[PDB]
């Protein structure tokens, strides 16, 4: 989907835009023999706030075989905590420190 | 039944390397 | 005559005794030690203090070895290509000076 | 003797360059322990014999 | 009886993982889990492949 | 929280830096003992380092736990590090620079936004001191703030190869390093260094003052030299082997001269231009601190 | 906003009552140990993901 500058500057207030944003972290390296780019890819639109609020994990691949890719995201520990029921039956995370 | 003998020898499999297009690491 | 012979009589005498003349594989066939500091094959060190003997150095056959290898095909198909650009004027070319 | 020469020669000219073939990575529990001690994570599906 | 509830097996949640894949990445080695471990861990491994 | 030792966090055995030497563990200094130099006709004079920009990346909020230690070490020493100049991590580092931040620097080197008590972390004053300078790694790529990628390497050579007399003089002949070596020694060394908990090193480099900082600089000079050595191999124009008496001697020409090489090679790690910018900026900050 | 209301509402009216579905009971030996430590005798054949 594409958004020309005009439409961002003139769209009705209260309408909901649907922007797209590349996570280009999974772009593999270019060949050593790929022709040079004389030009320059450019970008205009950016968010004012974090956008990856729903994001649990990122870049499930190895950099090398053992290194983590920069910007890779592990799942939060809380997603796995499955603690207990409370004395009254509410869900609880496991105690952090033993006490 | 007659007693018999038979041989064996380990097989070759040395193929030319496969040309994958997938890649393991970023 | 049995110079090539690695093993012999792979059967049990009784169930537990070895047949007389039965031949176990030499330990060296299984040693698969290491690469040397420079990459030559080596047997594992015998005693803990001594260095591992190069496999090529002795007359044993070792059927397990470390082999260095590329993880995937080196021929990726991204062959090098160049922009040749010819002289503008043949008469202007400087043959001179080496 | 000619055989030996042609063997020597054929070795002298072996320009083979190994690339990793298909390889399995057994879970440790799937293997008998004696095999698992020898195995090092992955191994070629065409294990030779030893 | 009044049908106060909605008895059901294998409940679905309010939240679920969604996942986008770049299909060009694939590990060369083929992991071989036991059939049981694949019965448990399978749908997870398949999704966060 | 870990209280910082009067000598600094590097005094702790948990943060000890070590490198395998043909596969056996060794202090960096005793690897640096194996180094030998053949001087050439060219000379390295050390120009003064421009003072680093006052500006810091905006302390913008970002989702997730940034892994800053691995980011820096990978950018400096890792094989084909990527996205070295991606801004987000550094914005978080600048957030660590703030006087009363909720952010913490784990000993893992991960940056946590929450105050997670289960994970031990460096003292916030010290990391504030460290981030207050090192967040400037964040503007490595902005044209206004790019560090010289060429002249700074003189300092690298001076701090590596340079004899105490040359380090006093500020000039040394351009040098060709060499050492008896094993296969892949430079890659293996780089791997050994990329695993280092360098945040303790830099945090001590920033938070420490007076006699403690000086004793730290003498105690740790060889560490910093190993880092400089990995970088120098990444930028050395040419690296080769020399067979002598059934022993290969690795040879890197030349120390202290950034070739601006970008294409990968077998012998050593390699800097893409973004990596070059990053390393140059890092060297600007780190030498600015080391020489004070 | 309407979405959130309808989400809130739809949660407010969830009258679901779980009944155990089909469940396996792996023998410990059939599992890798790391999985076996997490498993607690039985588990639903439709394990979700985690």
Give the residue on C whose Cα is nearest the Cα of D16. C69
Listed by number, the residues of chain F in 132-161 with a beta carbon closer than 8 Å to a beta carbon of chain A are: none
Asked whether E28 and B21 are in contact (CB, 8 A), the reply is: no
Cβ proximity of F193 and F77 under 8 Å: yes
Chain B residues lying within 8 Å of C72, measured CB to CB: 17, 20, 23-24
Inform me whether the C-beta atom of residue A26 falls under 8 Å from chain B C-beta atoms.
yes
Q: What is the C-alpha separation between F161 and F32, in angstroms, rounded? A: 9
Which residues of E fall within a CB distance of 8 Å from A57?
48
Q: CA geometry: angle at F208 spanning F202 and F213, to 5°?
A: 95
Looking at the DSSP bridge assignments, the partners of residue G17 are E7
Closest residue in A to F77 (Cα–Cα) = A67
- Give the distance from residue G34's alpha carbon to the nearest chain E alpha carbon, in angstroms: 10
Q: What is the DSSP string of chain C?
A: --TT---B--S-BTTTBPPTT-BPPPGGGG---EE-TTS-EEPPPSSSSSPPPBTTTSS---S------BSS-S--S----------S-GGG------
Nearest CA to F282 out of F90, F79, F4, F65 is that of F90
Pick E17's closest partner by Cβ from A26, A28, A56.
Answer: A56
Task: Give the Cα separation of F201 and F11 in Å (integer).
Answer: 10
Whole-number Å distance between alpha carbons of F116 and F198: 22
Resolution in A: 2.9
Count of C-beta atoms within a 10 Å radius of residue E46: 11
DSSP run (H or E) holding E8: strand E6-9
What is residue E38's three-state secondary structure? helix
Helix intervals (H) in chain A? 5-10
D19 Cβ under 8 Å from any chain C Cβ? yes
Backbone angles phi, psi at E8, to 5 degrees: -155, 155
**Which residue range is the domain that position F260 belongs to?**
1-292
For F228, other C-beta atoms within 10 Å of its C-beta total 24
G touches D, CB cut-off 8 Å, minimum 3 pairs: yes
The owner of tokens 């297009």 is: B21
Mutate to test the interface with B, among A24, A26, A60, A61 (most CBs of B within 10 A): A61
Backbone angle region of A59, left / alpha / beta, with phi > 0 → left and psi within -120 to 50 → alpha: left
Q: Which chains touch G (3 or more CB pairs under 8 A)?
A: D, E
Query: Strand pairing partners for D39?
Result: none
C75–B18 C-beta distance less than 8 A: no
Chains E and F touch (3+ CB pairs under 8 A): no
Q: Do A35 and C81 touch (CB under 8 A)?
A: yes
**Cα separation, F105 vs F113, whole angstroms:** 9
Token digits for F106? 């784990």
Residue partners of G24: CB distance under 8 A and separation at least 6: E39, G42, G43, G45
Q: At which residue do the structure tokens 């997870």 appear? A: E44
Distance, in Å, from the CA atom of A79 to the CA atom of A55, rounded to the nearest integer, reads 12
CB F94 within 8 A of CB F59: yes
| Residue of chain G with shortest Cα separation from D30 | G32
Structure-token pair, residue G49: 């993901």
Q: Collapsing DSSP states into helix, strand and coil, what is residue A10?
A: helix
State the SS3 of chain F.
CECCCCCCHHHCHHHCCCEEECCEEECHHHHHCCCEEEEEEEEEECCCCCCCCCCCCCCCCCCCCEEHHHHHHHHHHCCCCCCCCCHHHHHHHHHHCCCCCCCEEECCCEEECCCCCCCCEECHHHHHHHHHHHHHHHHCCCHHHCCCCCCHHHHHHHHHCCCHHHHHHCEEEEEEEEEECCCCHHHHHHHHHHCCCHHHHHHHHHHCCCHHHHHHHHHCHHHHHHHHHHHHHHHCCEEEEEEECCEEEEEEEEECCCCCCCCCCCCCCCCCHHHHHHHHHHHHHHHHHHCC
Alpha-carbon span F179 to F188, nearest angstrom: 14
Q: Which chains touch D (3 or more CB pairs under 8 A)?
A: B, C, E, G
Other chains touching E, judged by 3 or more CB pairs under 8 Å: A, B, D, G
CB proximity list for A98: less than 8 A, separation 6 or greater: none
CB atoms near residue F11 (< 10 Å): 19
Is there a contact between F117 and A97 (Cβ–Cβ < 8 Å)? yes
- Is residue A95 within a helix (H) or strand (E), and if so which, with residue range? none
In chain F, residues 33-72 whose CB comes closer than 8 Å to chain A: 61-65, 67, 70-71
CB contact (8 A) between residue D49 and residue B15: no
CA distance B8 to chain E (A): 30
CA F269, F273, F276, F281 torsion-angle sign: negative
- On whether any CB of chain C is under 8 Å from the CB of D34, the answer is no
Residues of D with Cβ-Cβ distance to G29 under 8 angstroms: 29
3-class DSSP state of B9: coil
In this complex, is the C-beta atom of A61 within 8 Å of any C-beta atom belonging to chain E? yes
Q: Which two tokens stand for residue C22?
A: 């039965």
Find how far residue F290's CA is from the centre of its chain.
12
Number of domains in chain F: 1
- E12, two tokens: 């679905």
**H or E element, residue D34:** helix D33-38
Structure tokens at F129: 């001191």
CB contact under 8 A, B10 and D48: yes
Length of chain E: 49
């Amino acid at each position: 989907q594409h958004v020309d500058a005009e439409s961002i500057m003139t769209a009705p207030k209260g309408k909901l835009f649907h922007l797209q944003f590349m996570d280009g972290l999974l772009r593999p390296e270019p060949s050593a023999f790929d022709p040079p780019a004389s030009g320059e890819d450019m970008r205009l639109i950016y968010p004012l706030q974090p956008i990856s609020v729903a994001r649990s994990m990122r870049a499930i691949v190895n950099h090398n075989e053992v290194d983590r890719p920069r910007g890779a995201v592990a799942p939060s520990s809380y997603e796995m905590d499955t603690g207990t029921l409370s004395r009254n039956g509410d869900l609880l995370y496991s105690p952090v420190a033993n006490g | 039944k007659i007693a018999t003998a038979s041989s064996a020898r380990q097989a070759d499999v040395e193929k030319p390397a496969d040309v994958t297009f997938t890649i393991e690491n970023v | 005559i049995s110079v090539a012979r690695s093993m012999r009589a792979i059967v049990n005498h009784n169930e537990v005794d070895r047949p007389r003349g039965a031949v176990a594989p030499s330990s060296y066939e299984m040693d698969t030690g290491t690469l040397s500091r420079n990459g030559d094959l080596l047997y594992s060190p015998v005693a803990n203090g001594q260095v591992g003997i190069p496999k090529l150095e002795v007359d044993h056959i070792s059927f397990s070895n470390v082999v260095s290898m590329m993880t995937a095909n080196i021929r990726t198909g991204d062959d090098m290509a160049v922009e040749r650009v010819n002289p503008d004027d043949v008469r202007a070319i400087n043959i001179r000076n080496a | 003797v000619s055989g030996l020469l042609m063997v020597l020669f054929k070795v002298m000219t072996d320009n083979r360059l190994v690339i990793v073939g298909e390889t399995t990575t057994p879970m440790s529990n799937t293997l008998s322990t004696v095999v698992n001690n020898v195995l090092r994570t992955t191994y070629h599906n065409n294990v030779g014999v030893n | 009886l009044s049908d106060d509830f909605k008895q059901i097996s294998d409940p679905k949640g309010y939240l679920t993982y969604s996942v986008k894949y770049e299909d060009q990445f694939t590990k060369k080695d083929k992991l071989r889990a036991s059939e049981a471990d694949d019965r448990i861990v399978g749908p997870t491994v398949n999704l966060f492949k | 929280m870990l209280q910082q030792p009067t000598g600094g966090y590097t005094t702790l055995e948990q943060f000890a830096f070590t490198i395998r030497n043909d596969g056996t563990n060794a202090t960096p200094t005793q690897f640096l003992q194996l180094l030998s130099y053949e001087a050439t006709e060219n000379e390295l004079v050390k120009k003064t380092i421009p003072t680093p920009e006052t500006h810091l990346p905006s302390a913008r909020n970002v989702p997730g736990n940034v892994y800053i230690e691995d980011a820096i070490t990978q950018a400096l020493f890792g094989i084909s590090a990527q996205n070295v100049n991606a801004h987000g991590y550094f914005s978080r580092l600048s957030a660590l620079a703030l006087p009363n931040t909720s952010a913490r620097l784990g000993l893992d080197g991960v940056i946590y936004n929450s105050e997670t008590i289960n994970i031990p972390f460096y003292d916030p004053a010290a990391v504030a001191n460290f981030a207050a300078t090192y967040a400037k790694l964040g503007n490595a790529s902005t044209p206004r703030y790019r560090a010289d990628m060429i002249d700074i390497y003189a300092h690298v050579g001076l701090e590596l190869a340079g004899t105490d007399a040359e380090r006093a003089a500020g000039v040394m002949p351009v040098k060709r390093a060499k050492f008896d070596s094993w296969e892949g020694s430079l890659i293996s060394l780089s791997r050994d260094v990329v695993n280092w908990k360098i945040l303790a090193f830099l945090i001590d480099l920033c938070s420490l003052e007076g006699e403690a900082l000086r004793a730290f600089k003498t105690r740790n000079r060889d560490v910093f030299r190993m880092m400089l050595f990995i970088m120098s191999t990444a930028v050395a124009a040419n690296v080769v082997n020399r067979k002598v008496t059934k022993r290969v001697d690795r040879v890197l020409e030349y120390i202290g001269v950034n070739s601006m090489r970008t294409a990968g090679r077998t012998a050593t790690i390699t800097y893409d231009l973004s990596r070059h910018e990053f390393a140059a900026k890092f060297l600007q900050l780190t030498f600015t601190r080391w020489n004070a």
